[PDB]
Amino acid sequence: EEHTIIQAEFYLLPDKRGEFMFDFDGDEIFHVDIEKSETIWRLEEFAKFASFEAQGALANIAVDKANLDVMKERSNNTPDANVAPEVTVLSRSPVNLGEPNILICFIDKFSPPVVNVTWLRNGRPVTEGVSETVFLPRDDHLFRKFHYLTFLPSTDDFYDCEVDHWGLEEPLRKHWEFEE
Amino acid sequence: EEHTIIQAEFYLLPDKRGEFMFDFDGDEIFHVDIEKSETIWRLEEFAKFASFEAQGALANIAVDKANLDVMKERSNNTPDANVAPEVTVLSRSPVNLGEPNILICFIDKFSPPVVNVTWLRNGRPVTEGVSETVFLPRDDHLFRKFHYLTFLPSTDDFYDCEVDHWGLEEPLRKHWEFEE
Amino acid sequence: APWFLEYSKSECHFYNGTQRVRLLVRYFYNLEENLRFDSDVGEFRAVTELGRPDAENWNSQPEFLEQKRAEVDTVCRHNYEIFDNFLVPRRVEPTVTVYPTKTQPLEHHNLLVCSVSDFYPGNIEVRWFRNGKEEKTGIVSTGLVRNGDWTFQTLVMLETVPQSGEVYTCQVEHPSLTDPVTVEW
Amino acid sequence: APWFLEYSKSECHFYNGTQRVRLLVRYFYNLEENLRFDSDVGEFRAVTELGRPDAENWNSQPEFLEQKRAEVDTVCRHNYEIFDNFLVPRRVEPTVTVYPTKTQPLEHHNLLVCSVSDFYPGNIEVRWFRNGKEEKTGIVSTGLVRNGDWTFQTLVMLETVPQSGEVYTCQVEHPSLTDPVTVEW
Amino acid sequence: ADLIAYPKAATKF
Amino acid sequence: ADLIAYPKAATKF
C-alpha cells in the first residue's frame, strides 16, 4: 500500500489569513476554520470515524504568524513575483439535459494562496448553489483549488468561471457550454 | 455598509462621442447628455433629491478630447483588437398572456463602446416602445448596456435582439419566445 | 477599423458608511489600463509604460496632488452624504411565486421553481423546505439578474420527486421585508 | 503587490502499510523551499541560505530533535491507524457508458468514447476491444481527473472506422468491483 | 436637491 | 472517533 498524508499550514500577509488542513493521497480530509475554531470535514461521514482538537491548529498558526515576521526581516527585500493560475472548467459527471449536474472550476499552479472566483450563468453572477474548497497543496510550492456550481443542463445557456489573481493582468474567464 | 460610487467618462474617435455618468452599486444614477448639456436621471424621482451642474462634465470631456490626441501620438501604432459582446434576452418580470411586459436585451463585456441594436418582432424592426441606456461601466475595462422593448405576450409571436459590433464577424441575433 | 478611446473611472469605495473611504482613479487607453491613483497611496502610479509620462508629470505638481487626495472628502464623502438620503435606503419588495415544471423528460414533475422578481437591493435569501426540513442540495439558480432599471430578479429551483402529502415551502428573506415571505406548494 | 507567506508541509510517506514510514517536513517562504526535515536523515537541513539560521538553531536542541524524529510514530503511524479504518478502504463504483462522436470532419463516426466517472480510488483499468481483440493503438485519454470531493472521472477514447458487424467493448477493472465491467457498442 | 461633486479631469502632455 | 495528532510548529529567530 502506497499512501501519503500531508498536513499543510500557512499564514499570509497582508491579507492576514491562515490555514491548517490534512490531505490524504491528494484529497482533503479536513481543515480548521480559524475564525470559528472548528474542524470542517471535507465529507460529513468522516466525522464519525475520527476527531481533532482545533486549538492545537490555532496554536500552530500563531507560531507561523510570529515566524513570518522573522522571515520578513531575515530576507530583507525578499519580496518577489507570483504565479498566475491555470483555470479549467468541466462537468462533474456526464451531462444530460434536464438532469441537474455540477460544473467544476479547477484553479491550479498558483501562489500566493488568494483568489476571487465568480460563477457566471449567461454572464450573470451566481451565488446560490455554489461551494468551494480551501487552498490545497501540490507536490511543489504552489496551490490548487476547486469551486462548484449546481446547474440545470440546457442547450441555450452558457457558463463562465471568473478568476482574479494578483499574477493576472485582467481577470480570467473560462467558458463552458453543453453539447450533446 | 459596503457601497461603491463610480463616475465614468470617455471620448471616442473616430465616432467623436463622449460620455459622463455616475454609477451606484452597479446601477446608473445619471448621465449628462453632451449635446443638450443637461443631466438625465436614470429614475425621474432622483431629480428631487439631488442636482448636478452639467457644464462641469462638459469641461471634463473637453479635457478627455485633448488627452486622446496626446495618447494617440504617445503610443504610435497603438491601434489594436476589440472585444465582441455577449448578448442575452429575458423578460423584465414574469410573463402572462395579454399582460404587457418588457423584453430586456443585455449587451455585456465589450469595447469599443459603440453598437447597433435592432429589436425584431417576427423578423420585423420595431422602433416604437423601445429605449436604452448609455454605455455602463464594469469592474474591468469593458462596457455593458441595456435595450428595452415593450410587448404584448402571445403564443405565436417571436422576438430577436440584433446586435452589431466591430468585434463580430456578422451581426449577432438572440432569440426569445413566450412559454407557459 | 481603427478606434481610439480615452476612458477613466473614478471609483469611491465605502466600508461601514463613510467610516473608511478609498478613492481609486483608473485610466484606460482602448483596452489597456495604463495608470491609476490610489488614495491609500497618495500619488499616481503607472500601470504600463504608456502611463509613465503622466505619473511623472502629475506627481511633480504638489498643488494638484493635494487636490486629488482631498477628493476623498470633497467628492467621495460629499456625494455619499447626498445619496445616503435616497439611494442607500432604497427598498423594493419582491414578488414571490412558485410553480412546477419538467426540464427533463416528463411525467409527474421534477423541478420546483421559486421565482423572485422586481426587488432591491440585491442581497437576498431564498430557501427551500420539504415538510419543515431545509433542502440544501438539489438547488439550481439563475443567479442575481440585474435589470438595469434598479430592480433584480432571480429563480431558485429545487430538484424533486414530489410524494403526495409533502408540502414544499419557498422562504424569502430581504431588507425590504419585516418578516420572511413564504409560499407553499 | 508585495506579499509574504510562511508555509509548511508535513508529509508522511507510507510503503506497504506502516511497514516503512518516512516523515518529510518542508518549509517555504513565498516561492522558495528553504529548509526541510527528512526523518531518514534525523535532522534539519537548509535548502537555501534563507533557511540556515533555523537549521543551526533547531539542530542544537537535542530535546526538540528527539521530538520530531518521534513524530514518525506519534503523528504518521498514529494517524495512519485512524485513517486505515475509513479512508484506506474507501471504494466507490464507477458509472460506465459508451457513446460515439465526430471530433473530426463528419459522416459516419470516428471516435468511440468510454466514459468512466464517479469512482474511487484513482487506480483503474480501461480497455477497448474490437470483436474480441484488444485495441492497443488509437487510444486517446483525458487522464485521471480528480474532482476534489473524493471521486474521479475519465474518458478513454478509441479512434475507429466502424464496419457493421463489428462489436466494440469497453472493459473497466477497478478495486470496488468484484468482476470487470463491460459495455458493448 | 444638494449638488453632486465630480472629480476634476487632469490635462496631459 | 480517535484523535488525529498534528506535528508541532517550531519558532524561529
**What backbone phi and psi angles, to 5 degrees, belong to C94?**
-75, 155
Whether D117 and D179 map to the same domain: the answer is yes
Residues C38 and C117 in one domain: no
- Cβ–Cβ < 8 Å for D34, D46: yes
Interface chains of chain C (3 or more CB pairs under 8 Å): A, B, E
Q: Are the Cβ atoms of E11 and B63 closer than 8 angstroms?
A: yes
Of A99, A141, A148, which to mutate for an interface test with D (greatest number of D Cβ within 10 Å)?
A141
Domain match, C111 and C178 both:
yes
Q: Return the biggest CA–CA distance within chain F.
A: 38
Spatial CA neighbour of F10 closest among A4, D56, A112: D56
Mutate to test the interface with B, among A116, A118, A122 (most CBs of B within 10 A): A122
What CATH number does residue D150 fall under?
A: 2.60.40.10
**Rg for chain A, CA atoms, rounded:** 18
Residue A119 has a CB neighbour count (10 Å cut-off) of 25
Contact C5 B13 (CB under 8 A): yes
Comparing alpha-carbon positions, the chain F residue that sits nearest to A73 is F13
Identify whether the C-beta of residue A143 lies closer than 8 Å to the C-beta of residue A110: yes
Write the CA distances from A59 to A41, C42, D37, F6, integer angstroms.
20, 38, 21, 11
C83 and C101 housed in the same domain:
no
**Taking an 8 Å Cβ-Cβ cutoff, which residues of chain A contact chain C?**
97-100, 119-122, 124-129, 150-152, 170
CB contact, 8 Å: A57 with chain F? Answer: yes
For chain E, say whether B136 makes contact (Cβ under 8 Å).
Answer: no
Interacting residues of C43 by C-beta distance below 8 A, sequence separation 6+:
C37, C55, C59, C65
Q: Is E12 within 8 Å of C53 when comparing Cβ atoms? A: yes
Strands C4-15 and B172-177: unpaired
Within an 8 Å CB–CB cutoff, is residue B162 touching chain A?
Answer: no
Position of cell 423528460?
C105
CA distance B5 to A47: 46
Same-domain pairing of C107 and C78: no
For residue C156, list its beta bridge partners.
C114, C141
Task: Tell me which of D60, D89, D118 is where a domain ends.
Answer: D89
Number of folded domains that form chain C: 2
**What is the tally of helices (H) and strands (E) in chain B?**
1, 14
Contact A60 F6 (CB under 8 A): yes
End-to-end CA distance of chain D: 56
Residues C115, C75 share a domain = no
Answer whether D146 touches A (CB < 8 Å).
Answer: yes
What Å distances lie between residue B149 and A3, B92, B133, B153, CA to CA? 62, 10, 12, 12
Q: Do D25 and F9 touch (CB under 8 A)?
A: no
The domain boundary residue, chosen from D40, D57, D89: D89
Residues 91 to 110 of B: which have CB under 8 A from any A CB? 106, 108-109
Solved with: X-ray
C-beta of residue C37 within 8 angstroms of C-beta of residue C51: no
**Size of chain D, expressed as the number of residues it contains:** 185
Phi first, then psi: what are they for B16, rounded to 5°?
60, 50
Is residue B21 within 8 A of residue B39, CB to CB? The reply is: no
Q: At D80, phi and psi to the nearest 5?
A: -60, -40
Residues D106 and D72 in one domain: no
B122 alpha-carbon distance from chain centroid: 24
What chain A holds in terms of domains, given with CATH numbers, is 1-79 (3.10.320.10), 80-179 (2.60.40.10)
> Which residues in A lie closer than 8 A to residue C102 (C-beta atoms)?
98
Do C106 and C80 sit in the same domain of this protein? Answer: no
Same domain, C102 and C151: yes
The set of cell numbers assigned to A174 is 473560462
List for chain F the helix, strand, coil content (%; round to 5). Answer: 0, 15, 85
Length of chain F in terms of residues written? 13
d(CA B55, CA B68): 20
Question: CA–CA separation, A153 vs A19, rounded Å?
Answer: 35
For chain A, say whether D133 makes contact (Cβ under 8 Å).
no
CB within 8 Å: F8 and A50? no
CATH code of residue C41: 3.10.320.10
- Summary count for chain F: helices (H), strands (E): 0, 1
| The amino acid at B114 | V
A160 and A120 Cβ atoms separated by less than 8 Å: yes
Work out the angle at residue D147's Cα, subtended by the Cα atoms of residues A51 and A156, and round it to the nearest 5 degrees.
135
Check whether residue C77 and residue C156 sit in a common domain.
no
* CA-based nearest distance E6→chain B, Å: 8
Q: Return the ∠ at Cα D160 (arms to D157 and D166), rounded to 5°.
A: 110
User: Under the phi-then-psi rule, with left for phi > 0, alpha for psi from -120 to 50, and beta for the rest, what region is A122?
Assistant: left
- Give the C-alpha distances (Å, rounded to integers) separating D95 from A105, D121, D129, D148, D154: 22, 14, 19, 18, 11
Q: B166 near B82, Cβ under 8 Å? A: yes
Q: What is the DSSP string of A16-31?
A: TEEEEEEEETTEEEEE
Last residue of a domain, one of C35, C57, C89: C89
Cα dihedral B15, B19, B23, B27, rounded to 10, equals -50
Instruction: List the chains bordering chain E where 3 or more Cβ pairs fall under 8 Å.
Output: B, C
State whether residue A90 sits within 8 Å of chain F by CB.
Answer: no
Grid coordinates representing A43 are 465529507
Please name the residues in contact with D185: beta carbons below 8 A apart, sequence gap of 6 or more. D98, D99, D100, D112, D167, D168, D169, D170
Q: Which residues contact D120 (CB under 8 A, 6 or more apart)?
A: D90, D91, D92, D150, D151, D152, D176
Can you give the residue range of the structural domain that contains C70? 1-89
Candidate from D50, D82, D150 with C-beta closest to A75: D50
Task: Verify that D54 and D95 share a domain, yes or no.
Answer: no
Which chain A residue is nearest to residue D31, measuring alpha carbons?
A141
Do C101 and C71 lie in one domain? The reply is no
B94 vs C156: CA distance, rounded Å = 14
Total beta-carbon pairs less than 8 A apart between chain A and chain C: 51
